[PDB]
Amino acid sequence: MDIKINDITLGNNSPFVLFGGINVLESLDSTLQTCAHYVEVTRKLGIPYIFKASFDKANRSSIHSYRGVGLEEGLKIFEKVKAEFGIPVITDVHEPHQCQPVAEVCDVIQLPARLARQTDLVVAMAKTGNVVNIKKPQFLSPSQMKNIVEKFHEAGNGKLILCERGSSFGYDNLVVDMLGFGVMKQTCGNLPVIFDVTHSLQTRDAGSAASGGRRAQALDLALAGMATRLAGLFLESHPALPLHLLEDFLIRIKALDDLIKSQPILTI
Amino acid sequence: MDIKINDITLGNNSPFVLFGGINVLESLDSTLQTCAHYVEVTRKLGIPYIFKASFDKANRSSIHSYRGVGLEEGLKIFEKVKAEFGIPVITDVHEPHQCQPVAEVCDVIQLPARLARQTDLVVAMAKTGNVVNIKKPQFLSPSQMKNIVEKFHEAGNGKLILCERGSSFGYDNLVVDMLGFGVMKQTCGNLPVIFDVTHSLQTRAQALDLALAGMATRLAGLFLESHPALPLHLLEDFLIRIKALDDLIKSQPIL
Amino acid sequence: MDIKINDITLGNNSPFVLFGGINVLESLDSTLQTCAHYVEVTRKLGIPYIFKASFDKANRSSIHSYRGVGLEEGLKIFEKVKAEFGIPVITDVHEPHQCQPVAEVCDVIQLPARLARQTDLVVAMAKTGNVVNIKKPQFLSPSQMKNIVEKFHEAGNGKLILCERGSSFGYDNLVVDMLGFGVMKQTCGNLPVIFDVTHSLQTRRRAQALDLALAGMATRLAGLFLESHALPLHLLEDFLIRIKALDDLIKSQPIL
Amino acid sequence: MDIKINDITLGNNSPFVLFGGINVLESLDSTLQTCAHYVEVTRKLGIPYIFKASFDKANRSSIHSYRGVGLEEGLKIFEKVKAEFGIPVITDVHEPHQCQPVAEVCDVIQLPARLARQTDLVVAMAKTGNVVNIKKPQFLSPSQMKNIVEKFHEAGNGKLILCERGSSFGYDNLVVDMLGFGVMKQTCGNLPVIFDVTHSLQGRRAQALDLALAGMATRLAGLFLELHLLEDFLIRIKALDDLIKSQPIL
Numbered sequence A: 001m002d003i004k005i006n007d008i009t010l011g012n013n014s015p016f017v018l019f020g021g022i023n024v025l026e027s028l029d030s031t032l033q034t035c036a037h038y039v040e041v042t043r044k045l046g047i048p049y050i051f052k053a054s055f056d057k058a059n060r061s062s063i064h065s066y067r068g069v070g071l072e073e074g075l076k077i078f079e080k081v082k083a084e085f086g087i088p089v090i091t092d093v094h095e096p097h098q099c100q101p102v103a104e105v106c107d108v109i110q111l112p113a114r115l116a117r118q119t120d121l122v123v124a125m126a127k128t129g130n131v132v133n134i135k136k137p138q139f140l141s142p143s144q145m146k147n148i149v150e151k152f153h154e155a156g157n158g159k160l161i162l163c164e165r166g167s168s169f170g171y172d173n174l175v176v177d178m179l180g181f182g183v184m185k186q187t188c189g190n191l192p193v194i195f196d197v198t199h200s201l202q203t204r205d206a207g208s209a210a211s212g213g214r215r216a217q218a219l220d221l222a223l224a225g226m227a228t229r230l231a232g233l234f235l236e237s238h239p240a241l242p243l244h245l246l247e248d249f250l251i252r253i254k255a256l257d258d259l260i261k262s263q264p265i266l267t268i
Numbered sequence B: 001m002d003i004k005i006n007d008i009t010l011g012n013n014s015p016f017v018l019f020g021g022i023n024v025l026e027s028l029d030s031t032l033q034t035c036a037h038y039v040e041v042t043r044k045l046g047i048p049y050i051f052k053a054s055f056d057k058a059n060r061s062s063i064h065s066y067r068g069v070g071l072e073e074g075l076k077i078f079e080k081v082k083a084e085f086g087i088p089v090i091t092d093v094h095e096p097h098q099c100q101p102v103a104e105v106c107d108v109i110q111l112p113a114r115l116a117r118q119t120d121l122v123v124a125m126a127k128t129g130n131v132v133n134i135k136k137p138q139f140l141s142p143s144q145m146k147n148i149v150e151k152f153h154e155a156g157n158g159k160l161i162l163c164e165r166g167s168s169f170g171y172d173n174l175v176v177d178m179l180g181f182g183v184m185k186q187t188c189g190n191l192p193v194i195f196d197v198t199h200s201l202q203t204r205a206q207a208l209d210l211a212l213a214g215m216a217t218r219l220a221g222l223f224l225e226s227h228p229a230l231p232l233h234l235l236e237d238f239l240i241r242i243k244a245l246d247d248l249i250k251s252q253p254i255l
Numbered sequence C: 001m002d003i004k005i006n007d008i009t010l011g012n013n014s015p016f017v018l019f020g021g022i023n024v025l026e027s028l029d030s031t032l033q034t035c036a037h038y039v040e041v042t043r044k045l046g047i048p049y050i051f052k053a054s055f056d057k058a059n060r061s062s063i064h065s066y067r068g069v070g071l072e073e074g075l076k077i078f079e080k081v082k083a084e085f086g087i088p089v090i091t092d093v094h095e096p097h098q099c100q101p102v103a104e105v106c107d108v109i110q111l112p113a114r115l116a117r118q119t120d121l122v123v124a125m126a127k128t129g130n131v132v133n134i135k136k137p138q139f140l141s142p143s144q145m146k147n148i149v150e151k152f153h154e155a156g157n158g159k160l161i162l163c164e165r166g167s168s169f170g171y172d173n174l175v176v177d178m179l180g181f182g183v184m185k186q187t188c189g190n191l192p193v194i195f196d197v198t199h200s201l202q203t204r205r206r207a208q209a210l211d212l213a214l215a216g217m218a219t220r221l222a223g224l225f226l227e228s229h230a231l232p233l234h235l236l237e238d239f240l241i242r243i244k245a246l247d248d249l250i251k252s253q254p255i256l
Numbered sequence D: 001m002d003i004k005i006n007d008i009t010l011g012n013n014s015p016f017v018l019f020g021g022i023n024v025l026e027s028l029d030s031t032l033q034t035c036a037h038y039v040e041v042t043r044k045l046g047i048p049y050i051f052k053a054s055f056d057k058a059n060r061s062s063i064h065s066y067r068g069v070g071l072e073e074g075l076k077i078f079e080k081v082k083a084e085f086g087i088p089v090i091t092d093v094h095e096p097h098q099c100q101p102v103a104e105v106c107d108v109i110q111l112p113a114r115l116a117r118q119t120d121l122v123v124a125m126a127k128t129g130n131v132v133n134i135k136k137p138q139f140l141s142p143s144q145m146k147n148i149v150e151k152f153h154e155a156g157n158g159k160l161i162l163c164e165r166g167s168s169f170g171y172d173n174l175v176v177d178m179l180g181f182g183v184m185k186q187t188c189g190n191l192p193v194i195f196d197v198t199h200s201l202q203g204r205r206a207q208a209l210d211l212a213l214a215g216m217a218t219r220l221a222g223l224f225l226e227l228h229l230l231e232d233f234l235i236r237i238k239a240l241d242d243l244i245k246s247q248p249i250l
């Protein structure tokens, strides 16, 4: 099943879409500057791009870390991003009451992994009728995603993206099961699957030392996921991977994606 | 560090405290019946007791599933439990705005495991000044519980209980690392550690074996659910065993 | 099901049996001294005791680490232990050809975890007719132990002990699933289940070994398997006092 | 570091090599038939090929299960495969005494994962001087492969292949950590790394293809694989391998 996002077609048989941006919105000027870097690199390669940021992030690593400019100013920033660059945008919500006003502006709304079973939020997000990105909790098996999808369907919204972010592996933070992508596609009606490679490399479960040198293998992880035929890649980059590297990185991802997406799926 | 909850002393070198009750509040009358059973059993066995129930199941599998009586009616039920039996109670909170009104009634308020990183919720719970029960996420290493404890300390509340509920073990399965208890005690200032045996068994006579094993490591409390979950009529027999072990362990000097 | 090992009764409802000793037989005099310390302490506390050591350790940290005294001299050392102290002994085997000569001397023979699905070794061990200790591999689940037990039964030997040593948990780490003991008892005919606390900790000390040991023994087990040099040898008495306390309590109550 | 196996170059920047065949050798005729199929498919696609089989099934579910032809007859069959098809072969060894006679015939000898810490087996395999395929244990972090490599080096054999076969994930289940390939390359001197997709897989056809594609995207020396399913698979794997190998390393 494909999802149309303005001009973009998002789907597991379509050219991959890049989701990226900044962690939290600070100001119009800082946002436009960072967005412009992604837009310039993606335009150089012809890759569809959706800008991501949080306006009120409730799960930062300290309780006084800045949560973002907030709903009213955040939406004004997102409006300007859409107008200036002509791209769609994506943000997370965590309060049911925020869903409707966010959905007036933001093309895709995101269901934080920790909240993925929270019924009042699921309903409120569903009722917006917007595209929704469902983050797969690290503690949920891929064959359980169908239950979250079922709740969205019960609440009347089928425009759903499934977002892989890794699975809990010992006290070693996260491992990504490359088979989980296929399990999701098969059980959830071939909804668009996207791969959050950045959060798959998170180390808040066990601390950074428990991940050893393994996180340096991030291009590899991205390539490996995209080899399984995916609608998109969710990826953070700042001058997260560095920006001199972003073009080189996307060249490799686009090469693989183009190769994969050009071949018919295996005969049956 | 010990925590006083009314007349109860909760701590890792004190007689274990039972946090027991039910999944979800469904009516006044069923709640009082179940709680009466727990009170009568625990009083005769001499086991300190805190009554547990959720007022809302916020993450059931269908949007049409029964969620329980809800906040307003749930607090009325908890007020009646406290009046009738004179015991403390515990319930979970899911939204920052629920924290102050829940804390006015419920002695202990509980941070759900999946919400343990929600900073707005941590702050709102902390501000209540109530005793807090921190459910350890299945995806968190025991040496990282300190990170949650640090947030509560920064928010000005140190009356914290650490609650084991198992660790993810592959897909759809949990294991309880019996060494984690000691890791939590050493790295979190010997705050009370309690064991949620019920949720640790998320896919028998297995509950007793697992409870015994956890309590062998010397813990402040046991957290469990029954249904009229352990069959309610087996409660007394179950607790006799747990108390026999707890008494023995607690009588041995710490090494 | 109980197993008699000389005058010892091993079983999940009997007083726990300590299986203790050392990693690798490296000498005669030092072996006897260490064994003597275990004997003195277990006799003082009334705890049944079986001395454990490897004669050939195929597991070493370097290619030229000493592998141990070997079969012939190792069996001689075991003979001396048995003559001097009058206790049973246990050791591991790695090759079918070693089964007979080791079984003639040793009261229990051990199947290494890595070899637990090696059919030729299983058959050769079964055919000795000796008591066998089956080490549960860290990569095998507790409900698969019944398949190893079946192979021994097909080969004619039912005098089997199941030994827990933890399960793989992420990378380079072990966790002991306290529920596995019950799964093994239920699916394998209530054969004796013992807990190798030493090897269950090898990726993680004294206070840890105690907590883990107590936790396991709370589940009602036939025995505890440990190495010293590994627990410091002088702390053996204190450690066993606490284990025996819990074991006596548990074992004195009927099963629920 | 590349390894030459006859006229095959095996390395992490070379065209991938297919290791495949059958589980356990049962007869000459069925072995030659299966091998001929792999040869015909790999030749027409231009993929280097090494034939794999065990002479013995060391783990069977019953004591009375069929065990395979055994060492003596197994080596006679491997000799005939090499004479008929002119390809290298690979088999596993389980006992030190088997190492020298197997190495006389088999180009690559394999260290089973469960036996990777058996020091006497390592030494005996090293002393053959043959190319060795080291199967990574399901509990070991990829950085710990360096400790096994060190042992082989100290025993005088540097012709080593590291082989991924998945990692234990709870009970009775495996996961392949796609980050581990790079870790093994970086910590073990860029020895060839190959991916045992068959044993990593605790329809199922489509799963094997997804997993194989994902691992080969990390840039590997080779792969193990068990109406024309082999060729359809290989066509896709070769397409991806060729693309990956044509990009400079980042």
Ligand SMILES: [Cl-]
Residues within 6 Å of the ligand: A061, A062, A063, A064, B150, B151, B154
């Ligand atoms: Cl903080």
Ligand SMILES: [Cl-]
Residues within 6 Å of the ligand: A113, A114, A136, A137, A138, A139
């Ligand atoms: Cl998560």
Ligand SMILES: [Cl-]
Residues within 6 Å of the ligand: B092
């Ligand atoms: Cl709960």
Ligand SMILES: [Cl-]
Residues within 6 Å of the ligand: A139, B113, B114, B136, B137, B138, B139
């Ligand atoms: Cl959890």
Ligand SMILES: [Cl-]
Residues within 6 Å of the ligand: none
């Ligand atoms: Cl041992």
Ligand SMILES: [Cl-]
Residues within 6 Å of the ligand: C113, C114, C136, C137, C138, C139
């Ligand atoms: Cl093992």
Ligand code: NA
Residues within 6 Å of the ligand: C102, C103, C104, C105, C106, C107, C108, C130
């Ligand atoms: Na004997």
